């Protein structure tokens, strides 16, 4: 079970850890999400190029296709939190707690 | 010899500075209009290597053209501070030179020299664009006579 | 005519870029079905050999398959040479 | 009266000339006069590698024809 796969999997692991931990902002978490997407693309591309699964090379393209759509929707959510909140931080997003 | 080498380096650097004097768009009063007419086709600053450029960060010579008043003097001094060295100040017109018509007013600086060190004094009210071109050429010769690396060699 | 012609003329007056884009799009949509060369294009894409024509075992019967590339029986693309 | 403009392009033309020739000449010099063989697909690269192998001197541009075979 070869080496480059280890580096891409480990990069995805740190990006998953980074997403699941917030510090201040909303953009940073979204960036960490798209980094997870990047690691997924690189991994899948490596897998299918190595296996000569020619009909499956469209799969990373569709990955990126829905990647950009989710990034867009998340940053529109950030637009609205900024419009109703002035800023984008998450610790002040607490109105739903009670 | 080292003196000859530093001499030639002085000539090269001084030639570059004098042949690409980039002035600033700091017209203040009627003295700016002549400042435009020498930029007009007849006299055409461009052929002498001088091309107008705002944003003091990328300019060398300031032609203070027009009356320098009290309300503007802090802005002029600050803007002169933004200029990275080497920098030169050309004073156009009697108002920017020593006060001009309104030398005895209450809100006029009695000479631009009181705020920045003026390098070339161009007289006129307003100076003819030929006279301002002559002042710029005089500043050019001034840069030509600089002895920076010579003084460094004789530190 | 009437309302339709007036609308076309007003659209040509006001927004000619939209009129041109819609006309080009409609043309590019509906012409390719009508044009007879489309099939030709497909055949050309079928004519271009990328993989080897792997030979098949001659167990006798099949007459159509050539026994040599120069042999006359088999598919030919003289049409492409002429066209 | 724009002929004074013309030198500016002229030398500049020379500037834009210098790479286009040089690369070509370099491609001729480093590949034995002939054009640099371009491998846009694996088949061309296989041909180039077999040329390097057959040449015996490990340069693909060195070509052998009828004299090499018996």
């Amino acid at each position: 079970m070869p080496l480059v796969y280890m580096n891409i999997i480990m990069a995805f692991a740190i990006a998953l850890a980074g997403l699941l931990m917030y510090r201040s902002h909303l953009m940073s978490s979204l960036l960490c999400l798209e980094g997870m997407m990047l690691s997924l693309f690189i991994m899948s591309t490596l897998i299918i190029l190595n296996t000569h699964f020619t009909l499956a090379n469209m799969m990373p393209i569709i990955l990126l296709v829905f990647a950009a759509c989710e990034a867009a929707l998340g940053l529109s959510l950030l637009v609205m939190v900024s419009n109703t909140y002035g800023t984008d931080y998450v610790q002040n997003l607490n109105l739903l707690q009670c | 010899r080292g003196e000859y080498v530093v001499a030639k380096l002085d000539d090269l650097v001084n030639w570059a500075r004098r042949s690409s004097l980039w002035p600033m768009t700091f017209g203040l009063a009627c003295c700016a209009v002549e400042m435009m007419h020498m930029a007009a086709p007849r006299y055409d600053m461009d052929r002498f290597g001088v091309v107008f450029r705002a944003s003091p960060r990328q300019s060398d010579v300031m032609i203070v053209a027009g009356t320098l008043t009290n309300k503007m003097a802090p802005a002029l001094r600050k803007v002169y501070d933004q200029m990275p060295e080497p920098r030169y100040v050309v004073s156009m017109g009697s108002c920017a030179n020593g006060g001009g018509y309104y030398h005895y007013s209450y809100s006029v600086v009695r000479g631009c020299d009181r705020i920045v060190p003026v390098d070339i004094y161009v007289p006129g009210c307003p100076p003819t664009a030929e006279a301002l071109l002559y002042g710029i050429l005089q500043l050019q010769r001034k840069i030509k006579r600089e002895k920076r690396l010579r003084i460094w060699y004789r530190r | 005519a009437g309302r339709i012609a007036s609308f076309l003329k007003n659209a040509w007056a006001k927004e000619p870029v939209l009129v041109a884009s819609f006309a080009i799009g409609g043309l590019a949509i509906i012409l390719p079905s009508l044009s007879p060369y489309t099939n030709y294009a497909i055949r050309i894409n079928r004519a271009t050999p990328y993989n080897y024509p792997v030979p098949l075992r001659d167990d006798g019967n099949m007459p159509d398959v050539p026994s040599h590339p120069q042999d006359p029986q088999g598919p030919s693309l003289e049409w492409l040479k002429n066209l | 009266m724009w002929f004074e403009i013309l030198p500016g392009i002229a030398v500049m033309a020379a500037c834009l000339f210098i790479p286009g020739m040089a690369t070509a000449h370099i491609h001729k010099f480093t590949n034995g006069g002939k054009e640099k063989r371009v491998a846009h697909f694996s088949y061309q690269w296989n041909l180039m590698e077999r040329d390097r192998c057959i040449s015996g001197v490990n340069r693909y541009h060195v070509t052998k024809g009828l004299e090499n075979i018996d």
Binding site: - | - | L31, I44 | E4, G8, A24
Partner: protein, 318 residues
């Protein structure tokens, strides 16, 4: 001697960029009844060297509110990419014969905006941030049409390799086949290079100097390097794409001369339009494209998608 080729694709390009300033200040000045630079030596042939010397000996102040690291990495990014995007051009024989040269150049052109981005943000100025955002909007709007027009034009090429364009335009210029797109393409080359009448990132009239406002001496000269190298490379790419030229395999010098002349003519038209128009107003140059360029280029994309099929003229991929 691959190093020799690399140096021969850099120093001549930098010299051409230097003389681009002189030919601009002369052609423009002659548009405006002036004479342009005339004093330094014969016909101003030393002005590029003179101001080159000044800009690298003038004091390169660093603002107190800057971000040092990006303030420095931005000029390097700009010049490095402007120089790198010259390597896949099929000047007789391309230096780097890439199978996806068009996509590569699109990628590096899209990267070049990041130099403007980081330089504007790191400078800590109102004008610089304004110019950075105008650059954001301009380059995204024009990049969409850049990609679509490139696809539409190259549909007749058969692939993305730059060299085959010469084979494509063997008997006729490609502009006779896609003259509408070419017009749009030219405008895009005007805007991606951030030139007139779309030079709103600098906006000398309204933004003093835009994203170069806090850039002085060497870094400023370097951003100018990137801008003018991009101008010449874009005109070269336009010449390669549409105005093809004859290429004798035995004498590539003929194709070199023809290509260089076409690039020179396209650049001269760049300075021509720079001195014959007012300047666009931000949203207009956006509303120009998202409402007039984008629909037309989509329609032309469908037209050029269908065109080889309806006429049985699909170009080969090899």
């Amino acid at each position: 001697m691959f190093m020799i080729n690399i140096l021969s694709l850099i120093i001549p390009i930098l010299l051409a960029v230097a003389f681009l300033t002189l030919v601009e200040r002369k052609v423009l000045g002659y548009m405006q009844l002036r004479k342009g630079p005339n004093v330094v030596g014969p016909y101003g042939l030393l002005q590029p060297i003179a101001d080159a010397l000044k800009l690298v000996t003038k004091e390169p102040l660093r603002p107190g509110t800057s971000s040092i690291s990006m303030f420095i990495i931005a000029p390097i990014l700009g010049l490095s990419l402007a120089l790198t995007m010259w390597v896949p051009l099929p000047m007789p024989y391309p230096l780097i014969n890439m199978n996806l040269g068009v996509l590569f150049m699109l990628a590096m052109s899209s990267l070049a905006v990041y130099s403007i981005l980081w330089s504007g943000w790191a400078s800590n100025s109102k004008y610089a941030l304004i110019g950075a955002l105008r650059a954001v909007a301009q380059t995204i709007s024009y990049e969409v049409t850049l990609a679509i027009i490139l696809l539409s034009v190259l549909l007749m090429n058969g692939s993305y390799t730059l060299s085959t364009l010469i084979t494509t335009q063997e008997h006729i210029w490609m502009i006779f086949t896609s003259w509408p797109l070419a017009m749009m393409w030219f405008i895009s080359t005007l805007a991606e290079t951030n030139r007139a009448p779309f030079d709103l990132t600098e906006g000398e009239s309204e933004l003093v100097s835009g994203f170069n406002v806090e850039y002085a001496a060497g870094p400023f000269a370097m951003f100018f390097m990137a801008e003018y190298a991009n101008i010449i490379m874009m005109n070269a790419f336009t010449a390669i794409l549409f105005l093809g030229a004859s290429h004798d395999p035995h004498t590539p010098e003929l194709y070199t001369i023809n290509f260089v002349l076409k690039t020179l003519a396209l650049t001269i038209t760049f300075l021509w339009i720079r001195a014959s128009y007012p300047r666009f107003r931000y949203d207009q140059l956006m509303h120009l494209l998202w409402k007039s360029f984008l629909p037309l280029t989509l329609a032309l994309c469908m037209w050029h998608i269908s065109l080889p099929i309806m006429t049985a003229s699909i170009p080969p991929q090899s």
